[PDB]
Design a protein around this nucleic acid. Structure first.
Lengths: 64, 64, 64, 64, 64, 64
RNA sequence: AAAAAA
RNA sequence: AAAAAA
RNA sequence: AAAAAA
Protein backbone atom coordinates (compact mmCIF):
# COMPACT_ATOMS: atom_id res chain seq x y z
CA UNK A 1 0.00 0.00 0.00
CA UNK A 2 0.79 3.74 0.22
CA UNK A 3 -0.56 7.17 1.11
CA UNK A 4 1.51 9.47 -1.08
CA UNK A 5 -0.11 8.24 -4.27
CA UNK A 6 -3.78 8.39 -3.27
CA UNK A 7 -3.10 11.90 -1.95
CA UNK A 8 -1.51 13.14 -5.19
CA UNK A 9 -3.99 11.26 -7.40
CA UNK A 10 -6.77 13.11 -5.64
CA UNK A 11 -5.30 16.57 -6.34
CA UNK A 12 -4.80 15.39 -9.89
CA UNK A 13 -8.32 13.98 -10.39
CA UNK A 14 -9.97 17.00 -8.78
CA UNK A 15 -7.76 19.59 -10.53
CA UNK A 16 -7.14 21.26 -7.15
CA UNK A 17 -4.58 24.06 -7.25
CA UNK A 18 -1.64 23.21 -5.03
CA UNK A 19 1.44 24.88 -3.62
CA UNK A 20 4.53 22.70 -3.76
CA UNK A 21 7.23 24.04 -1.46
CA UNK A 22 10.78 23.06 -2.20
CA UNK A 23 13.63 22.22 0.18
CA UNK A 24 14.97 25.74 -0.29
CA UNK A 25 11.68 27.31 0.74
CA UNK A 26 10.71 28.33 -2.82
CA UNK A 27 6.96 27.98 -3.48
CA UNK A 28 5.78 26.64 -6.83
CA UNK A 29 2.10 26.87 -7.76
CA UNK A 30 -0.03 25.02 -10.25
CA UNK A 31 -1.86 21.72 -10.54
CA UNK A 32 -0.60 18.17 -10.46
CA UNK A 33 -0.82 17.04 -14.05
CA UNK A 34 0.75 13.67 -13.29
CA UNK A 35 3.52 12.00 -11.36
CA UNK A 36 5.64 8.90 -11.01
CA UNK A 37 8.05 7.43 -8.42
CA UNK A 38 10.58 10.25 -8.65
CA UNK A 39 8.91 13.29 -10.23
CA UNK A 40 5.73 15.37 -10.31
CA UNK A 41 4.53 17.32 -13.38
CA UNK A 42 3.15 20.68 -12.37
CA UNK A 43 1.03 22.66 -14.79
CA UNK A 44 0.69 26.39 -14.73
CA UNK A 45 1.29 28.39 -17.90
CA UNK A 46 3.68 25.62 -18.80
CA UNK A 47 4.23 22.12 -17.44
CA UNK A 48 7.47 21.75 -15.50
CA UNK A 49 9.09 18.70 -14.00
CA UNK A 50 9.68 18.75 -10.25
CA UNK A 51 11.92 16.09 -8.71
CA UNK A 52 10.30 14.74 -5.49
CA UNK A 53 13.63 14.77 -3.65
CA UNK A 54 13.52 18.58 -3.82
CA UNK A 55 10.08 18.81 -2.28
CA UNK A 56 9.25 19.74 1.31
CA UNK A 57 5.47 19.84 1.25
CA UNK A 58 2.50 19.56 -1.06
CA UNK A 59 -0.24 21.86 0.20
CA UNK A 60 -3.72 22.03 -1.39
CA UNK A 61 -5.40 25.45 -1.51
CA UNK A 62 -8.50 23.64 -0.12
CA UNK A 63 -9.23 20.34 1.78
CA UNK A 64 -9.48 16.86 0.22
CA UNK B 1 13.02 -3.03 15.82
CA UNK B 2 11.49 0.18 14.49
CA UNK B 3 11.43 3.31 16.59
CA UNK B 4 10.12 5.75 14.04
CA UNK B 5 6.74 4.07 13.57
CA UNK B 6 5.83 3.67 17.24
CA UNK B 7 6.78 7.29 18.00
CA UNK B 8 4.86 8.65 15.04
CA UNK B 9 1.94 6.34 15.73
CA UNK B 10 1.62 7.51 19.34
CA UNK B 11 1.40 11.17 18.31
CA UNK B 12 -1.21 10.12 15.78
CA UNK B 13 -3.61 8.26 18.13
CA UNK B 14 -3.13 10.58 21.09
CA UNK B 15 -3.92 13.60 18.85
CA UNK B 16 -0.69 15.24 20.03
CA UNK B 17 0.14 18.60 18.42
CA UNK B 18 3.67 18.51 17.02
CA UNK B 19 6.18 20.87 15.52
CA UNK B 20 7.83 19.44 12.43
CA UNK B 21 11.14 21.14 11.64
CA UNK B 22 12.34 21.05 8.07
CA UNK B 23 15.93 20.70 6.85
CA UNK B 24 15.78 24.43 6.24
CA UNK B 25 14.70 25.46 9.71
CA UNK B 26 11.05 26.15 8.95
CA UNK B 27 8.69 24.95 11.68
CA UNK B 28 5.41 23.36 10.62
CA UNK B 29 2.69 22.99 13.21
CA UNK B 30 -0.29 20.69 13.37
CA UNK B 31 -1.25 17.11 14.00
CA UNK B 32 -0.28 13.83 12.40
CA UNK B 33 -3.23 12.34 10.54
CA UNK B 34 -1.25 9.50 9.06
CA UNK B 35 2.05 8.64 7.45
CA UNK B 36 3.70 6.00 5.33
CA UNK B 37 7.23 5.02 4.35
CA UNK B 38 8.10 8.36 2.72
CA UNK B 39 5.57 10.99 3.78
CA UNK B 40 3.69 12.33 6.78
CA UNK B 41 0.17 13.86 6.66
CA UNK B 42 0.00 16.98 8.84
CA UNK B 43 -3.30 18.66 9.67
CA UNK B 44 -3.83 22.28 10.62
CA UNK B 45 -6.07 24.50 8.45
CA UNK B 46 -5.78 21.76 5.85
CA UNK B 47 -3.78 18.59 5.30
CA UNK B 48 -0.41 19.05 3.65
CA UNK B 49 1.78 16.14 2.65
CA UNK B 50 5.25 16.50 4.13
CA UNK B 51 8.11 14.48 2.64
CA UNK B 52 10.17 12.79 5.38
CA UNK B 53 13.38 13.52 3.50
CA UNK B 54 12.68 17.21 4.13
CA UNK B 55 12.31 16.67 7.85
CA UNK B 56 14.89 17.30 10.56
CA UNK B 57 12.85 16.72 13.73
CA UNK B 58 9.35 15.94 14.93
CA UNK B 59 8.83 17.59 18.31
CA UNK B 60 5.83 16.81 20.55
CA UNK B 61 4.19 19.66 22.46
CA UNK B 62 3.47 17.50 25.56
CA UNK B 63 5.47 14.39 26.58
CA UNK B 64 3.95 11.17 25.21
CA UNK C 1 5.20 3.76 -16.14
CA UNK C 2 7.99 6.33 -16.28
CA UNK C 3 7.24 10.00 -16.68
CA UNK C 4 10.70 11.40 -16.22
CA UNK C 5 12.23 9.74 -19.28
CA UNK C 6 9.53 10.68 -21.80
CA UNK C 7 9.53 14.31 -20.63
CA UNK C 8 13.31 14.58 -20.72
CA UNK C 9 13.46 12.72 -24.02
CA UNK C 10 11.01 15.09 -25.70
CA UNK C 11 13.06 18.16 -24.74
CA UNK C 12 16.09 16.33 -26.08
CA UNK C 13 14.77 15.47 -29.58
CA UNK C 14 12.81 18.68 -30.05
CA UNK C 15 15.93 20.73 -29.17
CA UNK C 16 13.88 22.61 -26.57
CA UNK C 17 15.82 25.17 -24.49
CA UNK C 18 15.22 24.51 -20.79
CA UNK C 19 15.94 26.15 -17.48
CA UNK C 20 17.23 23.68 -14.92
CA UNK C 21 16.79 24.93 -11.36
CA UNK C 22 19.11 23.56 -8.72
CA UNK C 23 18.25 22.73 -5.11
CA UNK C 24 19.95 26.00 -4.27
CA UNK C 25 17.94 28.22 -6.57
CA UNK C 26 20.54 28.67 -9.29
CA UNK C 27 19.08 28.55 -12.80
CA UNK C 28 21.08 26.76 -15.48
CA UNK C 29 20.16 27.38 -19.10
CA UNK C 30 20.80 25.35 -22.20
CA UNK C 31 19.67 22.24 -24.00
CA UNK C 32 19.52 18.59 -23.05
CA UNK C 33 22.04 16.59 -25.07
CA UNK C 34 21.44 13.37 -23.22
CA UNK C 35 20.90 11.94 -19.77
CA UNK C 36 21.04 8.68 -17.87
CA UNK C 37 19.84 7.35 -14.54
CA UNK C 38 21.75 9.88 -12.41
CA UNK C 39 22.91 12.77 -14.61
CA UNK C 40 21.76 15.11 -17.34
CA UNK C 41 24.02 16.58 -20.07
CA UNK C 42 23.26 20.26 -20.62
CA UNK C 43 24.68 22.20 -23.56
CA UNK C 44 25.24 25.93 -23.76
CA UNK C 45 28.78 27.28 -24.33
CA UNK C 46 29.96 23.79 -23.42
CA UNK C 47 28.48 20.60 -22.02
CA UNK C 48 28.33 20.38 -18.26
CA UNK C 49 27.22 17.26 -16.43
CA UNK C 50 24.42 18.06 -14.01
CA UNK C 51 23.65 15.58 -11.22
CA UNK C 52 19.90 14.92 -10.97
CA UNK C 53 20.09 14.88 -7.18
CA UNK C 54 21.02 18.56 -7.38
CA UNK C 55 17.99 19.39 -9.48
CA UNK C 56 14.70 20.89 -8.32
CA UNK C 57 12.91 21.50 -11.63
CA UNK C 58 13.40 21.27 -15.38
CA UNK C 59 11.38 24.01 -17.04
CA UNK C 60 10.76 24.13 -20.81
CA UNK C 61 10.84 27.51 -22.57
CA UNK C 62 8.00 26.60 -24.99
CA UNK C 63 5.26 24.01 -24.29
CA UNK C 64 6.16 20.55 -25.60
CA UNK D 1 29.72 -5.07 11.50
CA UNK D 2 29.46 -1.29 12.08
CA UNK D 3 30.82 1.67 14.00
CA UNK D 4 27.85 4.04 14.10
CA UNK D 5 25.88 1.80 16.42
CA UNK D 6 28.54 1.02 19.03
CA UNK D 7 29.29 4.77 19.13
CA UNK D 8 25.66 5.79 19.72
CA UNK D 9 24.97 2.87 22.08
CA UNK D 10 27.82 4.09 24.22
CA UNK D 11 26.43 7.64 24.55
CA UNK D 12 23.11 6.02 25.32
CA UNK D 13 24.41 3.55 27.93
CA UNK D 14 26.57 6.19 29.64
CA UNK D 15 23.90 8.94 29.52
CA UNK D 16 26.53 11.32 28.09
CA UNK D 17 25.13 14.70 27.02
CA UNK D 18 25.67 15.20 23.31
CA UNK D 19 25.36 17.94 20.74
CA UNK D 20 23.78 16.81 17.49
CA UNK D 21 24.45 19.31 14.72
CA UNK D 22 22.10 19.31 11.80
CA UNK D 23 22.81 19.83 8.09
CA UNK D 24 21.68 23.44 8.44
CA UNK D 25 24.15 24.11 11.24
CA UNK D 26 21.49 24.11 14.00
CA UNK D 27 22.74 22.53 17.24
CA UNK D 28 20.42 20.30 19.25
CA UNK D 29 21.39 19.23 22.76
CA UNK D 30 20.29 16.39 24.97
CA UNK D 31 20.99 12.70 25.44
CA UNK D 32 20.51 9.77 23.11
CA UNK D 33 17.51 7.97 24.51
CA UNK D 34 17.48 5.43 21.68
CA UNK D 35 17.85 5.07 17.95
CA UNK D 36 17.18 2.87 14.96
CA UNK D 37 18.30 2.70 11.30
CA UNK D 38 16.82 6.06 10.33
CA UNK D 39 16.19 8.10 13.48
CA UNK D 40 17.62 9.08 16.86
CA UNK D 41 15.48 9.97 19.92
CA UNK D 42 16.98 12.88 21.78
CA UNK D 43 15.85 13.65 25.31
CA UNK D 44 15.99 17.05 26.88
CA UNK D 45 12.89 18.50 28.51
CA UNK D 46 11.00 16.45 25.97
CA UNK D 47 11.99 13.60 23.68
CA UNK D 48 12.11 14.59 20.02
CA UNK D 49 12.70 12.51 16.94
CA UNK D 50 15.68 13.44 14.79
CA UNK D 51 15.99 11.91 11.32
CA UNK D 52 19.62 10.77 10.72
CA UNK D 53 19.61 12.15 7.18
CA UNK D 54 19.44 15.64 8.68
CA UNK D 55 22.46 15.11 10.91
CA UNK D 56 25.98 16.41 10.30
CA UNK D 57 27.76 15.36 13.46
CA UNK D 58 27.19 13.77 16.84
CA UNK D 59 29.58 15.34 19.33
CA UNK D 60 29.88 14.15 22.97
CA UNK D 61 30.53 16.83 25.61
CA UNK D 62 33.28 14.46 26.89
CA UNK D 63 35.36 11.52 25.47
CA UNK D 64 34.19 7.89 25.15
CA UNK E 1 25.42 1.26 -19.84
CA UNK E 2 25.97 4.83 -18.55
CA UNK E 3 26.93 8.37 -19.48
CA UNK E 4 28.41 9.71 -16.25
CA UNK E 5 31.45 7.46 -16.47
CA UNK E 6 32.45 8.03 -20.10
CA UNK E 7 32.09 11.77 -19.43
CA UNK E 8 34.35 11.75 -16.36
CA UNK E 9 36.81 9.26 -17.88
CA UNK E 10 37.27 11.66 -20.76
CA UNK E 11 38.16 14.62 -18.51
CA UNK E 12 40.48 12.26 -16.70
CA UNK E 13 42.18 10.83 -19.81
CA UNK E 14 42.57 14.26 -21.42
CA UNK E 15 43.71 16.01 -18.21
CA UNK E 16 41.13 18.76 -18.87
CA UNK E 17 40.81 21.29 -16.06
CA UNK E 18 37.30 21.22 -14.65
CA UNK E 19 35.15 23.22 -12.28
CA UNK E 20 33.11 21.07 -9.92
CA UNK E 21 30.31 23.09 -8.35
CA UNK E 22 28.90 21.83 -5.10
CA UNK E 23 25.31 21.84 -3.84
CA UNK E 24 26.09 24.94 -1.79
CA UNK E 25 27.32 26.83 -4.84
CA UNK E 26 31.02 26.55 -3.90
CA UNK E 27 33.28 26.06 -6.93
CA UNK E 28 36.20 23.65 -6.72
CA UNK E 29 38.82 23.61 -9.47
CA UNK E 30 41.34 21.04 -10.56
CA UNK E 31 41.49 17.89 -12.65
CA UNK E 32 39.74 14.57 -12.25
CA UNK E 33 42.46 12.25 -11.05
CA UNK E 34 40.06 9.33 -10.65
CA UNK E 35 36.62 8.40 -9.41
CA UNK E 36 34.38 5.58 -8.30
CA UNK E 37 30.64 5.07 -7.63
CA UNK E 38 30.44 7.58 -4.79
CA UNK E 39 33.47 9.90 -4.97
CA UNK E 40 35.70 11.88 -7.31
CA UNK E 41 39.39 12.64 -6.62
CA UNK E 42 40.24 16.17 -7.65
CA UNK E 43 43.85 17.20 -8.04
CA UNK E 44 45.09 20.73 -7.66
CA UNK E 45 48.00 21.46 -5.33
CA UNK E 46 46.74 18.50 -3.37
CA UNK E 47 44.31 15.70 -4.16
CA UNK E 48 41.03 15.97 -2.26
CA UNK E 49 38.10 13.62 -2.09
CA UNK E 50 34.75 14.98 -3.25
CA UNK E 51 31.60 12.99 -2.49
CA UNK E 52 29.34 12.90 -5.60
CA UNK E 53 26.22 13.52 -3.52
CA UNK E 54 27.55 17.02 -2.82
CA UNK E 55 28.03 17.85 -6.48
CA UNK E 56 25.76 20.01 -8.63
CA UNK E 57 27.68 20.16 -11.89
CA UNK E 58 30.94 19.13 -13.50
CA UNK E 59 31.92 21.78 -16.03
CA UNK E 60 34.97 21.44 -18.32
CA UNK E 61 36.91 24.64 -19.09
CA UNK E 62 36.74 23.50 -22.77
CA UNK E 63 34.55 21.10 -24.87
CA UNK E 64 34.91 17.30 -25.05
CA UNK F 1 37.26 -1.02 -7.36
CA UNK F 2 36.79 1.27 -4.37
CA UNK F 3 38.59 4.57 -4.15
CA UNK F 4 36.95 5.98 -1.07
CA UNK F 5 38.21 3.31 1.32
CA UNK F 6 41.87 3.36 0.28
CA UNK F 7 42.00 7.17 0.43
CA UNK F 8 40.32 7.31 3.82
CA UNK F 9 42.40 4.40 5.09
CA UNK F 10 45.68 6.07 4.15
CA UNK F 11 44.81 9.24 6.08
CA UNK F 12 43.90 7.00 8.99
CA UNK F 13 47.15 4.98 9.24
CA UNK F 14 49.45 7.86 8.34
CA UNK F 15 47.83 10.02 11.07
CA UNK F 16 47.25 12.74 8.46
CA UNK F 17 45.37 15.83 9.70
CA UNK F 18 42.43 16.54 7.40
CA UNK F 19 39.86 19.22 6.84
CA UNK F 20 36.39 17.80 6.36
CA UNK F 21 34.05 20.23 4.61
CA UNK F 22 30.35 19.84 5.20
CA UNK F 23 27.55 20.35 2.67
CA UNK F 24 27.02 23.68 4.39
CA UNK F 25 30.55 24.97 4.08
CA UNK F 26 31.65 24.38 7.66
CA UNK F 27 35.21 23.06 7.94
CA UNK F 28 35.90 20.40 10.56
CA UNK F 29 39.50 19.72 11.49
CA UNK F 30 41.13 16.71 13.06
CA UNK F 31 42.22 13.19 12.29
CA UNK F 32 40.41 10.11 11.05
CA UNK F 33 40.25 7.48 13.78
CA UNK F 34 38.06 5.14 11.82
CA UNK F 35 35.06 5.03 9.53
CA UNK F 36 32.45 2.65 8.19
CA UNK F 37 29.91 2.61 5.39
CA UNK F 38 27.99 5.68 6.59
CA UNK F 39 30.10 7.59 9.12
CA UNK F 40 33.60 8.84 9.79
CA UNK F 41 35.18 9.20 13.27
CA UNK F 42 37.10 12.46 13.54
CA UNK F 43 39.40 13.21 16.47
CA UNK F 44 40.42 16.62 17.75
CA UNK F 45 39.57 17.61 21.35
CA UNK F 46 37.21 14.64 21.31
CA UNK F 47 35.82 12.18 18.80
CA UNK F 48 32.74 13.30 16.93
CA UNK F 49 30.84 11.06 14.56
CA UNK F 50 30.45 12.72 11.18
CA UNK F 51 27.79 11.40 8.78
CA UNK F 52 29.22 10.95 5.27
CA UNK F 53 26.00 12.25 3.73
CA UNK F 54 26.82 15.60 5.32
CA UNK F 55 30.26 15.69 3.77
CA UNK F 56 31.36 17.56 0.66
CA UNK F 57 35.13 17.00 0.70
CA UNK F 58 37.90 15.45 2.76
CA UNK F 59 41.07 17.47 2.26
CA UNK F 60 44.50 16.26 3.44
CA UNK F 61 46.91 18.80 4.93
CA UNK F 62 50.01 17.15 3.36
CA UNK F 63 49.99 15.03 0.17
CA UNK F 64 49.60 11.31 0.89
C1' A G 1 15.34 25.88 14.46
C1' A G 2 12.18 32.62 9.50
C1' A G 3 4.10 28.11 7.86
C1' A G 4 7.92 28.52 3.78
C1' A G 5 11.95 34.71 -1.58
C1' A G 6 8.24 30.99 -9.39
C1' A H 1 13.85 30.27 -8.06
C1' A H 2 21.48 34.89 -7.34
C1' A H 3 25.41 30.25 -14.50
C1' A H 4 27.01 29.11 -9.25
C1' A H 5 31.32 32.93 -2.17
C1' A H 6 38.41 26.76 -2.60
C1' A I 1 34.38 26.45 1.57
C1' A I 2 31.46 30.87 8.78
C1' A I 3 34.04 23.92 14.55
C1' A I 4 28.61 24.69 13.38
C1' A I 5 21.84 30.67 14.68
C1' A I 6 16.90 24.61 19.91
Amino acid sequence: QSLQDPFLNALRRERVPVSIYLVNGIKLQGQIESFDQFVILLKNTVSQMVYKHAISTVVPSRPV
